[PDB]
Symmetry: C3
Subunit: 511 residues, 3 copies
């Protein structure tokens, strides 16, 4: 029952095989892209899990014979464009595995696996709303190039990975040599045209295989029950509760507010909690679109209050503390004799007022560390005029916003503190989004609740001259070109404000 | 209250001490065999665990100081095998058995000392174990069998066998061999068992002296009438035809559903109905085989599942083989290197059985099957003298219903030929099964998961056309007679020969 | 809202900052002590956990850039902090300490200990401190606080004392065979500084004026207690307690409770709790009033002893030591040429239990190092005995003090092996029952006496003097007389034990 479908992808062949391998998986496909081979599978639990949480996991692993954080980064990469495309309220366990059986570094295993994963879900009976595809873009002598080779990347000014579906982009994640907003936005959409071909090719396959999807019947809310709950919510001043300034106190009051409504009033309880969460969600979203005020009283373009300090640790080579609202990071730098530069990120439970077991670095901590390292490596001096190794470790002492971005600001402080002759300071911020069908509002410097109840989390970092790194994921089907362009601009402003503050603290590398 | 009991075991002393050490354990014994010393203990939970599953664990560990300076996992699995089937049916207490090698003379097998240690500890305990059991190592030099050969005799034996069992029968065999005949193996087995019988004899005297007081296991007796009701609702809903569903996942789905309905008729009463259902399923399968001579995928006791294979499916790897037998499938990949010298690993992902779950480090089972594979193969691997390269093979189980471990041996033989390794001879393997009715027994060839689970044994044999290179067998009944054993070996010789025949269509000699 | 409070601590500055860092923690403080910096935090779960168990965790970690020990340090800090929470308070509390900068002359361990006290004291968590801790050395007859690295090279004592305003809470020490009075003085020299440190923390609390959360302890239903206390008297609780065999005692007690409860859900939780206190009381009463412990011993009698040497053929040295239902086997390996270490392993079968086997836990790492500390002082100079020495101790049974049994075991193994050691070493664990009328000190305690008693005070050393201590308590504090009496009675105890040990082997093999 083996079926082979073939095409071209940036000057080398792309083959997708199904029906032969891993047939107990809900769906499974083998991807040959040049000399790169990847087996991708998608499996779902039999019945759906309880509670309001969608367990979705993506793994990636490169076999020893195919030729250690990269695998974790890659798996996080593939999760991003796939996660938002499941019917709302679908809470089956879904696990997606990718095994790189053969790896030609000129033919991206990361991108092969991403398409592999899309295909495996698309042939499966799992109700995924793709296909999706992803692509790598470089930028050499003013020309964009798809899936550049190892040697072209040595020379590109951009290392971008874009992904999305038929009608829109889903995810971007990038590192760059300080390139303009418009250079980036063009790269994005050059990338998306190829994405569109790739999706096209996957749909023909789906049209040929004609898989039978499982039927997800989403329940329709009881108009009347909503109405009752929506009254007990209005009487107890939900609006004013939401507008509590302090993070922990806001969450405490909301919990309590819900904690009371539910006691009115088991399967009926599950509903009331769910109705409550949407009513909270709506209130927050309404306040922003209609009254232009966020739940800590800010306006869509205002950044949180900023504080910073340098040299706070006696014996360390460099040290920086950066505080933006209820998010705070301490970054520490060590120099060494003579991989050459790295940045780690640690997120303790106390940072969010929580108790729990202490572990080895998790997936998220590994992500943010590398994001930080990516944003910064472009401004680190040449080994030729500064022969030392540089390690930076960032500790998140408090968190409500973007620890990862705060750590980039922290680390820039530490680098200057330490007297590292860097190209230019770097700062970063995270952008948010509320869409109403009438229109959208872009939010600057978002807090946790805005990520959680918003539509995107779009992190941009770079210098005054331009962008050094991006990482973006979303919780709606797609982002239009004008929303991306606007976000980049408003993030350019945001970062500029932040570098301005940072230079009050230290205005150049120590001597 | 120290008591010392003494005897001879293959030309060296064997002493068993109890009453002094580890007296809070339900039972505990110290074993001195030559200069080897092992402390063995057996402990049971106070009350029995819930559900229909017998938690039994065996550990083995060799201290750092034991020599005056994966094997432990293999050894612990070895000791579990003959011990597990000998507990009263329905006994579901946690039982844990620990073995500590305090001193280790490699000429006096710590593995065997521990195995007898473990039997003794349970036998003196109040845990209702139905032994004793004992185990022995057999070599084969210039046509003579030898018990517990020394290191230097093993350098020269044609057989490395570990046999075990009780008073009246053999329980377990596990072996590696230089391509020896079926009768040469069966004799070794029963030479081994005569010594086993002495060892059991010696343990029984001890038990007769210590006179331990066992805990009283009252097995419930089934309600004749309730069985009858359930057995009708099962007959009306076509259990027989349900069982005969061809597709593995679909068979399990329908059976679950069938049970899923009967139970809803209809809490402590539910536990019973589920248990009654499982036995009725068990009986139907067993009946179909003994009486109608058809297995639940419609095969007959001697037919092997449909076979497919391929070589060279991975571009850049030195050797590559894909082997498919029914709904079980394995991909084996080979890497060559400069210059421990040969190894084989085995990986079993969850998707192989259509499951979701967390990915882990190699488990116990995966370590077992890997080594079983490596054992079956090492005998046919060339001398380092005429082929100076290291050889690693990794086998991935992409689907599973039968014997992954045997499929991986077939896969690896393909990969070795693919890679151009001048091997002695191809090797294949299979797993044999067994249904006993009191009237008579049927031996099953190439069993599927359900046949292992509801059958009486799982008897894996692998080797060349000239003879056997490896065995591993465990059982779920009290013992295996000599005629069954012999018949199984013969029918497994046929089975393997069929498989090598197919394999040679794919590749008929080393590339 | 940054606030900085400053003082002197043994000739160097001590600064405590709050209000700036880690403000989502219930409380948090930064400690600068010389060039050492430590951030300490204290966080509590929102609501209290179910069941009768207080989850309290302390972590400690020294960053890579700051320049088993971390586990030892974290266990150190837990000890004086644990007993000072209101009885029945069962919130998760976690306490973290991060050494951001570490000057080994200014103890990060002590900075963190005060850090942890401060973080709780500024928090809304109802901790009953402050507490503080201090290091004492002993050079040419003079005690010194927080000696530097180079002074420790030359001290005869490495002591860490801690406690609160009115009493000492915890001691843990290693020593070059020093007398009981020499130790007890060091302890109380240490406590005067502790008192300054607590004083300084109290002013801070008086300045910050934190608002504590209100812990309302329920009051027992006099009448329900009375009913339960009758069903307990009728079924012979007293006689049940006096069962000799450990497992059998626990089995009967479980069963006894198992019956009373069935009389008789939220009401059940109460009956179980009432039962546990009635058991607790019976045991305590028997000791104070009848002077008999629940295995029939008297407050000063040690359990029956047995020992053996050379039980393993091929190992360089081997010792088996049994004291009551606690038993340890210690094994020694010699090597070419960190130089001495002792490990401790505690399998589940040792207590008749089943469970998963793991990497060495926290407790096992503690006891191993306690053992190693007690012994290193008597191990020969590398000059006249050029070999590495590893000893591993296995606890085959346990009811008492495995850690002390392992020290006895290891001394046996060292002699067995022919190691020319300074002198044998033995150890024991002391216990305590306080009634408001008076107290009884218990020698060589069993598990139940630790669990239902007021302290667990382990002392080990030679005939000439003490080599190691480790003590924690379950009451607010220990007076000086109790701590002096315990040391003396532990000196006697150990002497008995060395006496027995020398019957087995009276000098290093030759």
């Amino acid at each position: 029952e083996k079926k082979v479908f073939k095409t071209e992808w940036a000057g080398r062949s792309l083959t997708i095989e199904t029906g032969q391998l891993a047939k107990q998986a809900n769906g499974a496909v083998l991807v040959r892209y040049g000399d790169t081979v990847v087996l991708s599978t998608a499996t779902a639990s039999k019945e759906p899990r309880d509670g309001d949480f969608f367990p979705l996991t993506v793994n990636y692993e490169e076999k020893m014979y195919a030729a250690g954080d990269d695998a974790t980064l890659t798996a996080r990469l593939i999760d991003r464009p796939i996660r938002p495309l499941f019917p709302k309220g679908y809470k089956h366990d879904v696990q997606i595995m990718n095994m790189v059986l053969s790896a030609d570094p000129d033919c991206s295993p990361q991108m092969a696996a991403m398409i592999g994963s899309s295909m495996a879900l698309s042939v499966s009976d799992i109700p995924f709303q793709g296909p999706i595809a992803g692509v790598n873009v470089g930028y050499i002598d003013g020309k964009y190039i798809i899936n550049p080779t190892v040697e072209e990347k040595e020379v590109s000014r951009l290392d971008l990975e874009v992904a999305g579906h038929k009608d829109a982009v889903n995810m971007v994640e990038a590192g760059a040599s300080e390139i303009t907003e418009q250079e980036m936005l063009e790269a994005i959409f050059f990338g998306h045209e190829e994405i569109q071909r790739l999706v096209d090719f996957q749909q023909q396959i789906v049209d040929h295989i004609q898989p039978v999807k499982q039927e997800f019947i989403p329940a329709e809310r009881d108009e009347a029950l909503v109405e009752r709950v929506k009254s007990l919510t209005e009487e107890k001043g939900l609006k004013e509760t939401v507008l509590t300034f302090d993070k922990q106190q806001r969450d405490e009051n909301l919990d309590n507010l819900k904690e009371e409504i539910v006691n009115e009033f088991e399967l009926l309880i599950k509903e009331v909690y769910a109705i409550l969460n949407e009513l909270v969600k709506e209130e927050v979203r309404r306040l922003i679109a209609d009254e232009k005020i966020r739940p800590d009283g800010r306006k869509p373009d205002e950044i949180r209050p900023l504080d910073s300090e340098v040299g706070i640790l006696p014996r360390t080579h460099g040290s920086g503390l950066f505080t933006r609202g209820q998010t705070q990071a301490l970054s520490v730098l060590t120099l060494g004799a003579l991989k050459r530069f790295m940045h780690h990120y640690n997120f303790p439970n106390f940072s969010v007022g929580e108790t729990g077991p202490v572990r080895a670095p998790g997936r998220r901590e590994i992500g943010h560390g590398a994001l930080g390292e990516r944003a910064l490596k472009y401004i680190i001096p040449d080994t030729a005029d500064f022969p030392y190794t540089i390690r930076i470790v960032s500790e998140v002492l408090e968190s409500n916003g973007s620890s990862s971005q705060a750590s980039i600001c922290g680390s820039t402080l530490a680098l200057m503190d330490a007297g590292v002759p860097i190209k230019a300071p770097v700062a970063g911020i995270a952008m948010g989004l509320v869409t109403r069908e009438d229109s959208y509002t872009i939010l600057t410097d978002i807090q946790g609740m805005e990520d959680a109840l918003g539509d995107m989390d779009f992190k941009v970092a770079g210098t005054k001259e331009g962008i050094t790194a991006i990482q973006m994921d979303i919780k709606i089907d797609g982002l239009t070109r004008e929303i991306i362009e606007e976000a980049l601009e408003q993030a350019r402003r945001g970062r500029l404000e932040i570098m301005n503050h940072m230079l009050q603290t230290i205005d150049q590398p120590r001597t």
